[PDB]
């Protein structure tokens, strides 16, 4: 699309979340 890639005028060029399973996004600092 157009919103997924880079944004408007650079914008969120640094917002690259690490696509991973919910376990990988929960267990590290779950406690």
């Amino acid at each position: 699309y157009h919103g997924g890639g880079s944004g408007f005028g650079g914008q969120l060029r640094s917002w690259n979340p690490p696509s991973e399973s919910v376990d990988a996004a929960l267990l590290p600092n779950f406690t």
Partner: protein, 67 residues
């Protein structure tokens, strides 16, 4: 020859800044007084005259914003 009076005006700015900008000089009935300018105008003169000459980059086009 822009670099010439660029350097001359820079030296004049420094010379005024420290102590040395002579206003009036007199010797036994031979006296001459030079008009003086505020340092701000001389600074702006340095600014846009060095911009006009081929002196290097010192200004950037605004500033972007991003998250």
């Amino acid at each position: 020859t822009r670099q010439e009076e660029l350097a001359a005006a820079r030296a004049a700015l420094h010379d005024l800044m420290t102590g040395k900008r002579v206003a009036t000089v007199q010797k036994d009935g031979r006296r001459v007084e030079f008009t003086a300018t505020s340092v701000s105008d001389l600074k702006k003169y340095i600014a846009e005259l060095e911009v006009q000459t081929g002196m290097t980059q010192r200004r950037r086009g605004p500033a972007g914003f991003y998250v």
